[PDB]
Enzyme design. Sequence first.
Site, PDB file in Angstrom:
ATOM      1  N   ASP A 159       1.182  -1.055  -0.067  1.00  0.00           N
ATOM      2  CA  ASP A 159       0.149   0.349  -0.079  1.00  0.00           C
ATOM      3  C   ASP A 159       0.617   1.130   0.106  1.00  0.00           C
ATOM      4  O   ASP A 159       0.973   2.370   0.780  1.00  0.00           O
ATOM      5  CB  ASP A 159      -0.782  -0.525   0.741  1.00  0.00           C
ATOM      6  CG  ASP A 159      -3.002   0.996   1.189  1.00  0.00           C
ATOM      7  OD1 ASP A 159      -2.209   1.509   0.140  1.00  0.00           O
ATOM      8  OD2 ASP A 159      -2.379   1.136   1.698  1.00  0.00           O
ATOM      9  N   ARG A 168      -0.070   8.891   0.629  1.00  0.00           N
ATOM     10  CA  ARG A 168      -0.790   9.104   1.802  1.00  0.00           C
ATOM     11  C   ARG A 168      -0.320   7.985   3.310  1.00  0.00           C
ATOM     12  O   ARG A 168      -0.646   8.658   4.164  1.00  0.00           O
ATOM     13  CB  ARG A 168      -2.420   8.375   1.825  1.00  0.00           C
ATOM     14  CG  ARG A 168      -2.051   7.403   1.207  1.00  0.00           C
ATOM     15  CD  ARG A 168      -3.615   6.752   1.286  1.00  0.00           C
ATOM     16  NE  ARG A 168      -4.087   5.469   0.882  1.00  0.00           N
ATOM     17  CZ  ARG A 168      -3.893   5.261  -0.667  1.00  0.00           C
ATOM     18  NH1 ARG A 168      -3.654   6.443  -1.696  1.00  0.00           N
ATOM     19  NH2 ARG A 168      -3.306   3.421  -0.730  1.00  0.00           N
ATOM     20  N   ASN A 169       0.522   6.950   2.406  1.00  0.00           N
ATOM     21  CA  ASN A 169       0.940   6.768   4.142  1.00  0.00           C
ATOM     22  C   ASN A 169       2.576   6.268   4.060  1.00  0.00           C
ATOM     23  O   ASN A 169       3.888   5.985   4.872  1.00  0.00           O
ATOM     24  CB  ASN A 169       1.158   4.894   3.298  1.00  0.00           C
ATOM     25  CG  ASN A 169      -0.385   4.343   3.445  1.00  0.00           C
ATOM     26  OD1 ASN A 169      -1.406   5.181   4.323  1.00  0.00           O
ATOM     27  ND2 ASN A 169      -0.542   3.915   2.260  1.00  0.00           N
ATOM     28  N   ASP A 174       2.562   2.390   7.852  1.00  0.00           N
ATOM     29  CA  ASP A 174       1.446   1.651   7.704  1.00  0.00           C
ATOM     30  C   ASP A 174       1.824   0.412   7.649  1.00  0.00           C
ATOM     31  O   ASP A 174       1.598  -0.486   6.464  1.00  0.00           O
ATOM     32  CB  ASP A 174       0.300   2.055   6.683  1.00  0.00           C
ATOM     33  CG  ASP A 174      -0.962   1.853   6.314  1.00  0.00           C
ATOM     34  OD1 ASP A 174      -1.523   0.923   6.997  1.00  0.00           O
ATOM     35  OD2 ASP A 174      -1.582   1.704   5.294  1.00  0.00           O
TER      36      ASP A 174
HETATM   37  C1  8ZZ Z   1       0.787   5.666  16.543  1.00  0.00           C
HETATM   38  C2  8ZZ Z   1       1.082   4.837  15.469  1.00  0.00           C
HETATM   39  C3  8ZZ Z   1       1.312   3.358  15.438  1.00  0.00           C
HETATM   40  C4  8ZZ Z   1       0.888   2.284  14.426  1.00  0.00           C
HETATM   41  C5  8ZZ Z   1       1.709   2.960  13.333  1.00  0.00           C
HETATM   42  C6  8ZZ Z   1       1.962   4.398  13.670  1.00  0.00           C
HETATM   43 CL1  8ZZ Z   1       2.802   4.536  11.436  1.00  0.00          CL
HETATM   44  C7  8ZZ Z   1       2.199   4.934  14.665  1.00  0.00           C
HETATM   45  N1  8ZZ Z   1       2.402   6.638  14.467  1.00  0.00           N
HETATM   46  C8  8ZZ Z   1       1.434   7.825  13.678  1.00  0.00           C
HETATM   47  O1  8ZZ Z   1       0.797   6.718  12.796  1.00  0.00           O
HETATM   48  C9  8ZZ Z   1       1.366   8.383  13.436  1.00  0.00           C
HETATM   49  C10 8ZZ Z   1       3.254   9.076  13.946  1.00  0.00           C
HETATM   50  N2  8ZZ Z   1       2.601  11.171  13.318  1.00  0.00           N
HETATM   51  C11 8ZZ Z   1       2.418  11.021  13.070  1.00  0.00           C
HETATM   52  N3  8ZZ Z   1       2.375  12.335  12.120  1.00  0.00           N
HETATM   53  C12 8ZZ Z   1       0.829  12.595  12.428  1.00  0.00           C
HETATM   54  C13 8ZZ Z   1      -0.136  12.234  11.075  1.00  0.00           C
HETATM   55  C14 8ZZ Z   1      -1.083  13.321  11.316  1.00  0.00           C
HETATM   56  C15 8ZZ Z   1      -1.242  14.443  11.203  1.00  0.00           C
HETATM   57  C16 8ZZ Z   1      -0.459  15.164  11.960  1.00  0.00           C
HETATM   58  C17 8ZZ Z   1      -0.274  16.502  12.598  1.00  0.00           C
HETATM   59  O2  8ZZ Z   1      -0.216  16.981  13.456  1.00  0.00           O
HETATM   60  N4  8ZZ Z   1      -0.700  17.058  11.209  1.00  0.00           N
HETATM   61  C18 8ZZ Z   1      -1.197  19.052  11.191  1.00  0.00           C
HETATM   62  C19 8ZZ Z   1      -2.912  19.115  11.142  1.00  0.00           C
HETATM   63  C20 8ZZ Z   1      -2.757  20.191  11.052  1.00  0.00           C
HETATM   64  N5  8ZZ Z   1      -2.084  20.832  10.459  1.00  0.00           N
HETATM   65  C21 8ZZ Z   1      -0.766  20.695  10.864  1.00  0.00           C
HETATM   66  C22 8ZZ Z   1      -0.039  19.490  10.386  1.00  0.00           C
HETATM   67  F1  8ZZ Z   1       0.926  18.916  10.660  1.00  0.00           F
HETATM   68  C23 8ZZ Z   1       0.743  14.773  12.357  1.00  0.00           C
HETATM   69  S1  8ZZ Z   1       1.276   9.631  13.335  1.00  0.00           S
END
Ligand code: 8ZZ
Length: 290
Positions: A137, A141-142, A155
């Site tokens: 995938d 987006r990932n 992901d």
């Molecule tokens: C926690 C976790 C468990 C399993 C797999 C994974 Cl890959 C993860 N880690 C994550 O999902 C993430 C790690 N860092 C992330 N950062 C993230 C993702 C989506 C949005 C933002 C975020 O702060 N977005 C703001 C929205 C407002 N405008 C400024 C942007 F930066 C940051 S998500």
Amino acid sequence: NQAVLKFTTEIHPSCVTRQKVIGAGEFGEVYKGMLKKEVPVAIKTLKAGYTEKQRVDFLGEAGIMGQFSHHNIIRLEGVISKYKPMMIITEYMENGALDKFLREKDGEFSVLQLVGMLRGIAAGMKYLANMNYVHRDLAARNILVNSNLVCKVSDFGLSRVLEDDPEATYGKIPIRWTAPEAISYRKFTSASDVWSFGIVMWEVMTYGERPYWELSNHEVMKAINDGFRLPTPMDCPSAIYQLMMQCWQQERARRPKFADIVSILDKLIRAPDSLKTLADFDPRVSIRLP
Ligand SMILES: Cc1cccc(Cl)c1NC(=O)c1cnc(Nc2cccc(C(=O)N[C@@H]3CCNC[C@H]3F)c2)s1
């Protein structure tokens, strides 16, 4: 997961503060939070009532991520499995998902910065491929982006990857990112990930244009089968368009490996004048003035 979970740190819930939702689904949310100084982290939860399958898929993502140690792969901090709700804790990528990031930052980076992003993604993917992990995938987006502009692949998992992605439609597949052999007969390999990487290259160089615009999934598949490919982005180095086109060879054996992609991108970055030669952009609009 019991074997691979022994590589992960069990974190006590009093060390974790959730602060802001940054992702959400039916069965849990993703938060920005802090981990005890104190460091920012991302926190994914699995709420009560989850099934056996959901638990295995959920902790399976952490188990897979715990096996990886690479600059361009999201880092696992630990898990909460002894208390509920269960949680997965990772490093916090301050700039979020790459597709949304580029669409919100249209035109704001140099060609060199964009190619550097691609080199980081390719390095992560080479690592995954050589670790015998097929992503299935790969798409902007990932990919997540931090405050140093470092792009990291995210992901992970088995069936949850394509099940959880709204872009994957009924096999359940994100059609316009997927290689022909994976669509036709379910053959997912690192070489079909290379096809997807070519799409990611196009997404990056267009600042997040949606691949194939409004063509339907069937129209995309027909177009690819008849030999059509995505046209050159605006302001795209010739070498970069050539490379993405080679990722889209119908014959899987003819595609570059990620080892080749990393090497080529590294050479272009190290001699950056090579990126000033642009592929011709075919304008969709004619504007003429006396
Ligand atoms: C926690 C976790 C468990 C399993 C797999 C994974 Cl890959 C993860 N880690 C994550 O999902 C993430 C790690 N860092 C992330 N950062 C993230 C993702 C989506 C949005 C933002 C975020 O702060 N977005 C703001 C929205 C407002 N405008 C400024 C942007 F930066 C940051 S998500």
